[PDB]
Write a structure and sequence with these properties.
386 residues; D-Maltodextrin-Binding Protein, domain 2; 2 domains; seven-stranded mixed beta sheet; four-stranded mixed beta sheet; globular; binds a molecule of 2 linked components (GLC-GLC); sugar binding protein, protein fibril; fusion protein; amyloid; sugar binding protein; protein fibril
Length: 386
């Protein structure tokens, strides 16, 4: 109703291959007459639940699977209906990532994990440990370069270090995540965040560094290393930088443990075009030709579609992505994930900027993460005085 019948509107993050996705949309339109419009709103993962709560928003939303349990619990995502032959085309573990309360609530697209990206002309042998980074930066600074820059504003990028020596989100046991058993303020989490904060205090990193600042610096050759996902490789290809993609550094001898996302496509529960969305996703996007179009724009990572992953696997960068994914953990998709991420975002930004100590910051994050959230998608705009 509110979403227009007879067309598809799609939202996807602006760092992904939205132009390639639009090409698949234009093919669909040429074949079927059905217009497909791709948009990449800022903060789409916050906008979606707000507008979808009223029956508006896109027909299809692309995001990592971790947000989708919350959306489904709120009644905002449709159960999908792929048949067995279709399900056979994708890796079983990717279907598990989009299963919520026994139901499939999105189409898996690709497996995303962070890797260490390095400039082979500044650093032909990248460091195997976090511990050696301060000395490396000291050496490079004397010559007008830095060792490492990555996004310090989103906790996704610092999580691998927090988790390395023992940090965790929710304990999983016997078919359930226990929201009362959270691992954000244990000794391992404290050790990792303390190491990051010390890097900042010793002027090896800047607390204000964000995604754009880090990407620009790496791609200009000002910093020897960054931490990012497969989507970023396209812009580095364009840049003058000769780069490699490798395993994340260890911390206290333990592998960094990135939280692994499955980029997924959910169908708005209010869409009058659920059948059109199914046809588009199963018969146009999740094909070798469709994924190629998106992947050529911005790499997806290790795709869920078996036939195309076999092609993409011939690539040391994908081998590295998989190595890092296997050392980390697939994110939970439970509704509590939103609270978890907001809590850890606050702790990381506050500790990095010197607004809180590490102990103070993570104690707060532990409290909010483990608080069973009576969640609402209501807002002030619908409020009425009674
Ligand atoms: O930083 C917290 C943030 O992490 C994840 O978002 C990732 C996403 O998985 C990637 O596809 C890519 O877009 O980078 C994002 C971080 O900027 C979680 O998916 C998200 O819920 C969480 O807020």
């Amino acid at each position: 109703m509110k979403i227009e019948e007879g067309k598809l509107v799609i939202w996807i993050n602006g760092d992904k291959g939205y132009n390639g996705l639009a090409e698949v949309g234009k093919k669909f339109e040429k074949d079927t007459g059905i217009k497909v419009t791709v948009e990449h709103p800022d903060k789409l993962e916050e906008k979606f639940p707000q507008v979808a709560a009223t029956g508006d928003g896109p027909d299809i939303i692309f995001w990592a699977h971790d947000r989708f349990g919350g959306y489904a619990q709120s009644g905002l995502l449709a159960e999908i209906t792929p048949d067995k032959a279709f399900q056979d085309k994708l890796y079983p573990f990717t279907w598990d990532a989009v299963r919520y309360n026994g139901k499939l609530i999105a189409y898996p697209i690709a497996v995303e994990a962070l890797s260490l990206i390095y400039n082979k002309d500044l650093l032909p042998n990248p460091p195997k440990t976090w511990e050696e980074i301060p000395a490396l930066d000291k050496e490079l600074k004397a010559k007008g370069k830095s060792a490492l820059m990555f996004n310090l504003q989103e906790p996704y990028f610092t999580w691998p270090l927090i988790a390395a020596d023992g940090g965790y989100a929710f304990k999983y046991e016997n078919g359930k995540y226990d929201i009362k058993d959270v691992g954000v303020d244990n000794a391992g989490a404290k050790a990792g965040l303390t190491f990051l904060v010390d890097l900042i205090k010793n002027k090896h990193m800047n607390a204000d560094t964000d995604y754009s600042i880090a990407e620009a610096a790496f791609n200009k050759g000002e910093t020897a290393m960054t931490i990012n996902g497969p989507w970023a490789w396209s812009n580095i290809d364009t840049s003058k930088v000769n780069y490699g993609v490798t395993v994340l550094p260890t911390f206290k001898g333990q592998p960094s443990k990135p939280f692994v996302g499955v980029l997924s496509a959910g169908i708005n529960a209010a869409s009058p075009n659920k059948e059109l969305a199914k046809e588009f996703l199963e018969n146009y996007l999740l094909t070798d030709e469709g994924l190629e179009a998106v992947n050529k724009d911005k790499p997806l990572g290790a795709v869920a579609l078996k036939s195309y992953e076999e092609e993409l696997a011939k690539d040391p960068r994908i081998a590295a992505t998989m190595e890092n994914a296997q050392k980390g953990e697939i994110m939970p998709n439970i509704p509590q994930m939103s609270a978890f991420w907001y809590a850890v975002r606050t702790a990381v930004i506050n500790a990095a900027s010197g607004r809180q100590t590490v102990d103070e910051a993570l104690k707060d994050a532990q409290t909010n993460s483990s608080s069973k959230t009576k969640e609402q998608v209501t807002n002030v705009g619908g409020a009425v005085v009674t």
